[PDB]
Amino acid sequence: STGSATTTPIDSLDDAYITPVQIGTPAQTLNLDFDTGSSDLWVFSSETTASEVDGQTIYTPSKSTTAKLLSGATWSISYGDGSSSSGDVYTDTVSVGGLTVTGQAVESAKKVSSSFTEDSTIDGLLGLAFSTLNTVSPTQQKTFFDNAKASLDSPVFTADLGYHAPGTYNFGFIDTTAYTGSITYTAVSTKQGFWEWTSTGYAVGSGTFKSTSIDGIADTGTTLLYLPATVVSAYWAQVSGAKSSSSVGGYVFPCSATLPSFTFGVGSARIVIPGDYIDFGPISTGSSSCFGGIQSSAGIGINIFGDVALKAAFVVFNGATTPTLGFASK
Numbered sequence: 549s550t551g552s553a554t555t556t557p558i559d560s561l562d563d564a565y566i567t568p569v570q571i572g573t574p575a576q577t578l579n580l581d582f583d584t585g586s587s588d589l590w591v592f593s594s595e596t597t598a599s600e601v602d603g604q605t606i607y608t609p610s611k612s613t614t615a616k617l618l619s620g621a622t623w624s625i626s627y628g629d630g631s632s633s634s635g636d637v638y639t640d641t642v643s644v645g646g647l648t649v650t651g652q653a654v655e656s657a658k659k660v661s662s663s664f665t666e667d668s669t670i671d672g673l674l675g676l677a678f679s680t681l682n683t684v685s686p687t688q689q690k691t692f693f694d695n696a697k698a699s700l701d702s703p704v705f706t707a708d709l710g711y712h713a714p715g716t717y718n719f720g721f722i723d724t725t726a727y728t729g730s731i732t733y734t735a736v737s738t739k740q741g742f743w744e745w746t747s748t749g750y751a752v753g754s755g756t757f758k759s760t761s762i763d764g765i766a767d768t769g770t771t772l773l774y775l776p777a778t779v780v781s782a783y784w785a786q787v788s789g790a791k792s793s794s795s796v797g798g799y800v801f802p803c804s805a806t807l808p809s810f811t812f813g814v815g816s817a818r819i820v821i822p823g824d825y826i827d828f829g830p831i832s833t834g835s836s837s838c839f840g841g842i843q844s845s846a847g848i849g850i851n852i853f854g855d856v857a858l859k860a861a862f863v864v865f866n867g868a869t870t871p872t873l874g875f876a877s878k
């Protein structure tokens with residue numbers, strides 16, 4: 549089997565991407581944030597505290613003839629940005645882009661933190677990291693990919709995120725029309741439950757490439773590119789008037805600037821992030837200070853190849869017995 553779904557930026561800055569997902573019988577279509585940095589499929593629901601729902605579409609398990617309570621199971625998750633959610637669990641039929649999994653754990657939110665409530669465009673998350681991070685207790689549950697894997701034509705999914713435009717998530721096949729040149733594959737460590745890999749270095753604009761190992765995660769659920777402070781300082785030093793602002797919470801730059809590109813290494817290959825991808829616009833409406841898309845990871849404990857980096861590539865998440873990542877230009 550295969551599946552193919554379009555993913556759409558939630559706003560003009562590409563802050564996140566939403567992908568429609570069919571849940572239940574008859575189908576209830578929710579727009580989920582596909583997150584390769586977590587492993588829970590959770591939704592706004594008929595159980596969510598009413599004051600914490602503000603425009604999201606909800607899953608109502610009582611209207612699904614295939615929904616079953618997963619008796620005794622609870623979940624609770626906290627994300628890198630300080631957001632959280634928790635609740636109880638159903639199993640139900642879940643389809644993405646024509647690919648169907650029966651018996652998928654659908655984590656129903658009873659509580660969500662303010663950042664979720666305040667985002668009307670995201671109806672929940674679909675985790676695509678390794679199932680070892682799934683938070684369901686007392687019986688840990690599998691991701692949608694792990695449940696689909698054995699049925700897929702090839703045990704892979706691909707992320708093809710657009711810059712200020714829709715893109716695609718494919719399951720079970722590699723669309724050889726979707727990228728230029730060849731795919732370079734690189735080793736993955738699953739020890740922390742992430743798609744963790746080691747970049748071979750970076751360049752800033754037309755500058756020389758610096759060969760240096762940068763361990764980090766491929767994370768579709770993180771907006772920005774978080775790298776070591778040395779690398780980030782080297783980038784922003786090429787932008788007149790850029791500075792790290794403790795009050796704003798990262799590097800800002802004059803909105804009048806033209807940003808240089810940023811290149812990262814994948815083995816002997818190179819992915820170029822155009823400068824425009826690094827502009828996240830005014831810090832507040834009408835400001836001439838703009839927020840940067842490359843930020844320090846120093847306060848995180850891990851480097852994160854988030855959407856700013858991934859949207860510059862066609863990315864293969866290879867779930868073979870020994871997982872690997874692939875990157876191609878596009």
Ligand SMILES: O=C1CN(Cc2ccccc2F)CC=N1
Pocket residue numbers: 563564629667769770771772
């Ligand atoms: O990397 C992230 C992911 N997400 C970004 C975001 C920002 C503004 C509005 C919506 C949105 F999803 C939440 C925080 N950090």
